[PDB]
Design a protein around this ligand. Sequence first.
Ligand SMILES: CC(=O)Nc1ccncc1NC(=O)[C@@H]1Cc2ccc(F)cc21
Ligand SMILES: CC(=O)Nc1ccncc1NC(=O)[C@@H]1Cc2ccc(F)cc21
Lengths: 304, 304
Amino acid sequence: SGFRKMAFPSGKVEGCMVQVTCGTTTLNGLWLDDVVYCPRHVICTSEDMLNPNYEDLLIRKSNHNFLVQAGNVQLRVIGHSMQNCVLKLKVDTANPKTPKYKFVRIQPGQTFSVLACYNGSPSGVYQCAMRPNFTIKGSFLNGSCGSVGFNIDYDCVSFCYMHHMELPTGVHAGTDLEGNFYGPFVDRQTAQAAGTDTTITVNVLAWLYAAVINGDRWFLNRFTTTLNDFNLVAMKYNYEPLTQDHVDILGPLSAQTGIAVLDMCASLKELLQNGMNGRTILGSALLEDEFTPFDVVRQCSGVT
Amino acid sequence: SGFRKMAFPSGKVEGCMVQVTCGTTTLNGLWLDDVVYCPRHVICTSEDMLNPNYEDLLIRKSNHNFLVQAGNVQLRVIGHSMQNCVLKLKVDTANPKTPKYKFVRIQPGQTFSVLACYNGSPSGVYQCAMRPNFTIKGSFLNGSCGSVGFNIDYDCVSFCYMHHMELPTGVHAGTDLEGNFYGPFVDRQTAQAAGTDTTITVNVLAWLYAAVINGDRWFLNRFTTTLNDFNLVAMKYNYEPLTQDHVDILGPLSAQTGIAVLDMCASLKELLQNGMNGRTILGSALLEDEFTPFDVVRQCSGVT
Ligand SMILES: CC(=O)Nc1ccncc1NC(=O)[C@@H]1Cc2ccc(F)cc21
Ligand SMILES: CC(=O)Nc1ccncc1NC(=O)[C@@H]1Cc2ccc(F)cc21
């Protein structure tokens, strides 16, 4: 028993972190096979960030200008190319620690672990969710760019995020491993604002199921609702509209607890309408939305 | 910017996890050099757990009864001994992945990362605190016994916890790596209750400093208080009494923000007396106490 915001073991990803320096800028790179992936803004100075022409800036850079270091050993750069907002540095040595890996672009609402790094060295690991407004609420400082987000499936690491930018509002923006930003963000020091951040309703429900499995049942009421009646309340509280796909995905959690999805929705509706009244659910005084139904099933069944 | 419940990178500890089987019981072991450490209740059946005589039970066990597996390779057991509530299985092969390590017994209020494991395989990593009542609020299922708690200092892993038991109340109990339980708990299936769980005041204050550094300043008021006046309010809310050592430890956070410790105490006092009024601090609707002043300084400065 017990329910915690759990991250995947980071070992396989730690073995891939390198330091990439270009000029005066140092950030993190991801070394997989003979390619080092890093944010393309490594080629910029803070002056360039106002309106960078990355194609023009990259033209003044050669293989020998990109300093790549894995631990205290220097990697030899034999190629460089820009793919969207990431640079791919071809090195002459394949990473001996490359795990089985995939590059996947995640959907808003899905979760992933971040291995926060500085100078190619890991400092910490935490669990995140790709917010519906395509931002992530991470913990990143200067030097953390190039830190990656991933999921693990037994032995296969699915890389889904590379950290690029902190918005003036304190939230974080980045790309998938093909260099495409999540959301409308651009790698430029300009006024960019995150849109409305809605709550991932399906994740809140999955977390309510985790609370029930783990003993917290005070919020269960004698009521039920319909998908349309629940969504009228979800819109008012800036919650994502619940779809039949969401109800289907919650199926195994509903089967395990013996509580129908629409019954759990009625409990959620009353929690939204009346608040927690000073009570907690899984040690939290607010509705948690960063656990997918997959995360709940995984944590409650012990998937290694 | 951003503040997250961060765990240490788990790679160095993953390389130490093994599976220990004795009879029908399978749990996790920690392989360091030529010794595998695991909970001694590995030698018990659920029937023995009611009133186990571990010395008598261990007498019926030989080296060949302890099956140790690191991945899919079997380790040869050449010795076995009981040290308090842990078994130390001497193997003929030193772990090639043994990091620089220490065994340390932590103080209540201090934090550490847990690498939750099943069958010697890691499933997740999360940050915990040793509660003042010597329990931990973890996420552990059947098979998780032997999962360890640790801290990292550059390259040195300090092992501080081994998971042993879940109390009937859903909280967790375990030992240091010498087999001594934290608290009054015994490895027996008997009625054991966790005492009163007080809030780690110094950690709450450090987290208020993290909130200020990271932008959340709504709770800052025009007041101050004294150590004695603050502690009168801390007692009423089951908060640990704040000592001058705690004020001293908060020194660097007070120096960084320019807010005196006793001024932050007055903000905390008003938060205890009036609640959050539906507002949040660092995305939390309750006062967080599982970040030490060291964790805040570490996260906000990027220690790798
Ligand atoms: C100074 C600090 O702590 N900065 C960070 C913190 C957390 N995460 C990232 C950064 N870095 C940036 O946000 C730089 C500035 C800018 C503009 C566009 C862009 F694509 C990347 C960047
Ligand atoms: C069944 C399940 O999930 N159990 C766990 C969950 C989480 N953590 C541990 C366990 N295991 C126990 O608590 C066993 C029972 C007992 C009594 C004393 C003792 F020293 C160890 C144990």
